[model samples]
Target: WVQPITAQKPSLTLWLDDKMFTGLINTGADVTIIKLEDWPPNWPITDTLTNLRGIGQSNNPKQSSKYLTWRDKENNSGLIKPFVIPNLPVNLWGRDLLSQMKIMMAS
Candidate 1:
């Protein structure tokens, strides 16, 4: 069966698991989270990184705030070159998830 792709300017039509939705309905929690970091930070909405997903169920994509080492791409030196790549402690926290659940968040 071929499913027609919906073209939403800033939306992705995802199939939420029926079972998961039902479970959430019973929980009474206000939101749900999904991982979308691989979503390019240079896309049409990249300029507004924080609001990347725009009106969709999403939040700030974060990374670890620690420094690590690697071979500098510039030169394959034996020296262990160090760099900082922020590690995302919390994946996401925002109104998008709540919106997906039809839950309202207080500003």
Candidate 2:
């Protein structure tokens, strides 16, 4: 757990249903989204009517049917229904939920 934080992509450790992964922090994104490939096995996903515009293109995302519990670096915990997008570059931690966590970035 002593690995140095890389400056390449601003990130923080985030959790889903108690399982953890690195979430790329970005204030530019309005909502939190995870790549389809990153979705946990056996987790239930529901269809979402929302289409997100990332960088320049539109993406339709699937959402978790049941709210998933989350954990953060600052010892915070909560529940959220996250969207899953196919081929997303990384697990994006957007301003929406990141605002709730009140996370700060260092670069």
Candidate 3:
């Protein structure tokens, strides 16, 4: 039997639009987040809304959908359609991106 290991927050190197960037990795994260100002203007965004919740039960954040192109430090690249929170605290490298890359996480 396998046991779940609560992992410490890890930083990952990645590429956004072919530019190198760092992001915090979270396996449970559903969507990758970036600052509204950092969001690329050329990427197409849809008029869609999504609700996200975290530790604080009462604070459900609403976001919009946007397409993202990313690459790992090894140059493995993929695309992700994630929600854009206008006031996100940090850049998140979420499971959605890993899923898109067909990555399986296991010990």
Candidate 4:
């Protein structure tokens, strides 16, 4: 899904429930995350939750057992188990899901 859009950064377009979403390809992220507002309310909720750590701090984010399916620009589908962060401002396609989907980032 990663394509070189700039000299240092790559970008990709992904489909969530067939809805097109544009995002950057970040290899540093550890877990796939979605904004609380963007999260599908109809999806099953789980009792599990986890604390997410960043550069200097951490916060508890809800974890769900629900699986998400996404598609690349070419319509290649991928599966991921995501974490729903209440205040997360960005949608990060993390390495955990990327590896499962066999998507590699270019150097």
Better of 2 and 4 by lDDT: 4
Best-to-worst ranking by lDDT: 4, 3, 2, 1
The local distance difference test score of model 1 is: 0.26
For each candidate in turn, the TM-score is 0.20, 0.54, 0.56, 0.58
Q: How many backbone clashes does candidate 4 have?
A: 0
Per-residue lDDT over 1-107 for candidate 3, one digit per residue giving the tens place of the 0 to 100 score: 11222344546557767677765555555656655555656764334443345654453455445657777666765666565666763666567666544335544
Q: Please name the candidate that would achieve the greatest lDDT relative to the true structure.
A: 4
Candidate 2 lDDT by residue in tens digits, 17-71? 6566555555465656666676666764556544556665664555543434556
Q: Which stretches of candidate 1 lie over 4 Å from their true place?
A: 1-85, 105-107
Per-residue lDDT of candidate 4, residues 1-107 (tens digit) = 43433432436667667677765555466766666666668764443554456674654545554556677666764657766656663666667656544455534
lDDT of every predicted structure (CA atoms)? 0.26, 0.55, 0.56, 0.58
Cα-lDDT of candidate 4 = 0.58
Top candidate on TM-score is 4
> Candidate 2 at residue 75, lDDT?
46
lDDT of 1 at 40: 30
- Per-residue CA lDDT of model 1 for 1-107, tens digit only, reads 11222331222222222111111111132222222332234432111124345657565544322221111122221111111113321222223333433334436
